[PDB]
Amino acid sequence: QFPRQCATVEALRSGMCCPDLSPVSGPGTDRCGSSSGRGRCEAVTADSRPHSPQYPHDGRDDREVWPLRFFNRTCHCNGNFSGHNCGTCRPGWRGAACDQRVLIVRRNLLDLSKEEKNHFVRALDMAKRTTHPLFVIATRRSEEILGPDGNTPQFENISIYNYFVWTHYYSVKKTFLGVGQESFGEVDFSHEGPAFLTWHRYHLLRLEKDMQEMLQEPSFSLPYWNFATGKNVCDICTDDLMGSRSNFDSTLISPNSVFSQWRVVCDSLEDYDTLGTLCNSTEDGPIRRNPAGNVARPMVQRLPEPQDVAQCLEVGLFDTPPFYSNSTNSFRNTVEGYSDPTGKYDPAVRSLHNLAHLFLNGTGGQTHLSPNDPIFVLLHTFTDAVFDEWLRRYNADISTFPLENAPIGHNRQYNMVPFWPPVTNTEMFVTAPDNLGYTYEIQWPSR
Ligand SMILES: *[C@@H]1O[C@H](CO[C@@H]2O[C@@H](C)[C@@H](O)[C@@H](O)[C@@H]2O)[C@@H](O[C@@H]2O[C@H](CO)[C@@H](O[C@@H]3O[C@H](CO[C@H]4O[C@H](CO)[C@@H](O)[C@H](O)[C@@H]4O)[C@@H](O)[C@H](O[C@H]4O[C@H](CO)[C@@H](O)[C@H](O)[C@@H]4O)[C@@H]3O)[C@H](O)[C@H]2NC(C)=O)[C@H](O)[C@H]1NC(C)=O
Ligand SMILES: *[C@@H]1O[C@H](CO[C@@H]2O[C@@H](C)[C@@H](O)[C@@H](O)[C@@H]2O)[C@@H](O[C@@H]2O[C@H](CO)[C@@H](O[C@@H]3O[C@H](CO[C@H]4O[C@H](CO)[C@@H](O)[C@H](O)[C@@H]4O)[C@@H](O)[C@H](O[C@H]4O[C@H](CO)[C@@H](O)[C@H](O)[C@@H]4O)[C@@H]3O)[C@H](O)[C@H]2NC(C)=O)[C@H](O)[C@H]1NC(C)=O
Ligand SMILES: *[C@@H]1O[C@H](CO)[C@@H](O[C@@H]2O[C@H](CO)[C@@H](O[C@@H]3O[C@H](CO[C@H]4O[C@H](CO)[C@@H](O)[C@H](O)[C@@H]4O)[C@@H](O)[C@H](O[C@H]4O[C@H](CO)[C@@H](O)[C@H](O)[C@@H]4O)[C@@H]3O)[C@H](O)[C@H]2NC(C)=O)[C@H](O)[C@H]1NC(C)=O
Ligand SMILES: *[C@@H]1O[C@H](CO[C@@H]2O[C@@H](C)[C@@H](O)[C@@H](O)[C@@H]2O)[C@@H](O[C@@H]2O[C@H](CO)[C@@H](O[C@@H]3O[C@H](CO)[C@@H](O)[C@H](O)[C@@H]3O)[C@H](O)[C@H]2NC(C)=O)[C@H](O)[C@H]1NC(C)=O
Ligand SMILES: *[C@@H]1O[C@H](CO)[C@@H](O[C@@H]2O[C@H](CO)[C@@H](O[C@@H]3O[C@H](CO)[C@@H](O)[C@H](O)[C@@H]3O)[C@H](O)[C@H]2NC(C)=O)[C@H](O)[C@H]1NC(C)=O
Ligand SMILES: *[C@@H]1O[C@H](CO)[C@@H](O[C@@H]2O[C@H](CO)[C@@H](O)[C@H](O)[C@H]2NC(C)=O)[C@H](O)[C@H]1NC(C)=O
Ligand SMILES: *[C@@H]1O[C@H](CO)[C@@H](O)[C@H](O)[C@H]1NC(C)=O
Ligand SMILES: [Zn+2]
Ligand SMILES: [Zn+2]
């Protein structure tokens, strides 16, 4: 989850992730671009406020008080500079001086042209294969992070798109308690709490940025999939888009789509939760996808209706106590999908975003795996569009986003786990077009 420049014995020992930008006088002579005023290495700011009693294991999980278990000094950039070493720009800015505004448009995937749809499919496939230039992934927890001999960092290179899968897996994985003990599962740093919407917003922002740089196309944008059509087929599952059903196995993607060639990461939970290891970059197994196929669970055999979206946008409070998956009259919990679209909680209901996952009846409907199916990207740009329309309609009212006593990882000033550089829920809780450099070309139904 860290810059490869920081995945070193020296850096892990010093507790400092403050890499050079333009060091002319040797290594360490331009940390954070301080030579040119772009930033300085400074102490980390991390949330110290209480969380709900759902998690009883403080001191046991590296994700706690992110990123203090790994680094307590980081680059603090000035002005509109940003990034791990202050070498890029805050959202909405670009250029070598971070003084050119940028506004990218995220469109309905079905409204793209033939060339644009093809360009997008090729861009995903390229991200699946291209090594992430900056980030490497830990394969062991902190105590074993330097390997058996104490001098070999347990990090791996990983592709741009598998990194997108990995951070998701790491935010939802169980707390490892010890060999021979059951791993603890009532923890999730990106779901079942107020941070669900802002965590997934940054997730997309980061992938869109990495894909722009991979392509060297600064205006590249992620499209969305309007899944609220009431249909019981997947209208983007075609061989020019995200792949039709295989005629040889109804749970695999058609061999006429490159997405039948993808192999998935992080599907060895039994190993991680018993051995105490983490998902690594070795791929194993194809995408499973069987839209409408869950005959044993008929409620998840049809997608949400248009009116379900219109109703969830009538829910006025962003979130409500206990800020969890049983919150009632909470917009966050409604659109996440643990309440029906009017806001009323019911333990048996799956709606909206949750329902769209389960409709896929495959890789895309399992929490630790779901980004492996690239429909995830489009399902979440649409979810992010609902969120952005809510922020417009209710003046980005953050007042019900709790400052304390949220489930762990979901307090307002928590650094969302495991994003780098550190970034809070508050930074994503702004209307996108004015503040984050992107906007949705979309229309909202009535009633
Ligand atoms: C920011 O991180 C700094 C680097 O630490 C690493 O990275 C962070 C992110 C974590 O992952 C951490 O686990 C990593 O170690 C960190 O600097 C380190 O801080 C410790 C504690 O202050 C320094 O310890 C000092 O060292 C010597 C001896 O080293 C060990 O000895 C004693 C045994 O007696 C241990 O208890 C210590 O923890 C040391 O590990 C001692 O001179 C001294 O310990 C004595 O005094 C203190 C205070 O009275 C007592 O707690 C002890 O019991 C001892 O009586 C110091 O504690 C460690 O050397 C230092 N490393 C470096 C490279 O500087 C820093 O604390 C972090 N800052 C913040 C604000 O979080
Ligand atoms: C929203 O969900 C909340 C979290 O729910 C979790 O996940 C779901 C799926 C359920 O399974 C749920 O039970 C899980 O916890 C939920 O909060 C939970 O609410 C329940 C019911 O009020 C609480 O259980 C009761 O808690 C007390 C307190 O326990 C603590 O303190 C005592 C004293 O220090 C210690 O002994 C405990 O170990 C804990 O430290 C218990 O006293 C009590 O036991 C009594 O009842 C049981 C019958 O079940 C008898 O066996 C006992 O003898 C006692 O008579 C209960 O266990 C639970 O703590 C709480 N969990 C958390 C994490 O907050 C919340 O209610 C939901 N909200 C709504 C509106 O539905
Ligand atoms: C990247 O991550 C992947 C995914 O975790 C790792 O690959 C897996 O590694 C695990 C752990 O080593 C492997 O799981 C083990 O497989 C063994 C071989 O299985 C034979 O015997 C079992 C009986 O249990 C049969 O079901 C099976 O068909 C074979 O005949 C088993 O021996 C293991 O169980 C035994 O060992 C463990 C200790 O590991 C004991 O606790 C158990 O009680 C038991 O005795 C275990 O199931 C797994 O097969 C690997 N998967 C793949 C796809 O390769 C990579 O290693 C990892 N890479 C890096 C570099 O970290
Ligand atoms: C990630 O992979 C790189 C190599 O891959 C290259 O860099 C990536 C960041 C991407 O751009 C890839 O597409 C690209 O191919 C590994 O870097 C390599 O590390 C090794 C081991 O430390 C280096 O070997 C050394 O080489 C010299 C001889 O050349 C000797 O002095 C040393 O004894 C030692 O053997 C190697 O030079 C280095 N670079 C390259 C280009 O191969 C990197 O380790 C890896 N990171 C992780 C965390 O696995
Ligand atoms: C995709 O949909 C299929 C088909 O609906 C799902 O398979 C079904 O999974 C359920 C839950 O595990 C199975 O129910 C179980 O059945 C037996 C008794 O027969 C018992 O062990 C349990 O008590 C439980 O009720 C169900 O049998 C099974 N159906 C089939 C045809 O295998 C599948 O889980 C879905 N996959 C994903 C990833 O969503
Ligand atoms: C960095 O970007 C911010 C906006 O993200 C700039 O601030 C705006 O600048 C215009 C033009 O001067 C003002 O009219 C706005 O009122 C400003 N908004 C805010 C929120 O300050 C800022 O000037 C840019 N440059 C820096 C910080 O050097
Ligand atoms: C929905 O799919 C079912 C099987 O899942 C199929 O029988 C049916 O024709 C589809 N749609 C409608 C509108 O009945
Ligand atoms: Zn998710
Ligand atoms: Zn999701």
Coordinates of N, CA and C and ligand atoms in Angstrom, one line a residue, residues 168 191 196 200 353-354 357 364 370 376 379-380 383, ligand 9:
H168 N -9.0 -2.9 -1.7 CA -10.3 -3.3 -1.3 C -10.3 -4.5 -0.4
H191 N -17.1 -0.7 4.5 CA -18.5 -1.0 4.4 C -19.2 -1.0 5.8
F196 N -18.5 4.2 3.9 CA -18.7 3.4 2.7 C -18.6 4.3 1.5
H200 N -15.2 4.5 -1.2 CA -15.3 4.0 -2.5 C -15.1 5.2 -3.5
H353 N -27.1 -0.7 -4.1 CA -25.7 -1.1 -4.4 C -25.5 -2.6 -4.0
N354 N -25.9 -3.0 -2.8 CA -25.8 -4.4 -2.4 C -26.5 -5.3 -3.4
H357 N -24.6 -6.0 -6.6 CA -23.5 -7.0 -6.4 C -24.1 -8.4 -6.5
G364 N -18.2 -11.0 -8.5 CA -18.6 -9.6 -8.2 C -19.6 -9.5 -7.1
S370 N -14.9 -8.8 -4.9 CA -15.7 -8.2 -6.0 C -15.1 -7.3 -7.0
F376 N -17.3 -4.0 -11.3 CA -17.2 -3.3 -10.1 C -17.0 -1.8 -10.3
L379 N -20.3 -0.2 -11.5 CA -21.3 -0.3 -10.5 C -21.0 0.8 -9.5
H380 N -19.7 1.1 -9.2 CA -19.4 2.1 -8.2 C -19.3 3.5 -8.7
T383 N -22.9 4.4 -8.3 CA -23.1 4.6 -6.9 C -22.5 6.0 -6.4
Ligands
ZN9 ZN -19.6 -2.4 -3.8

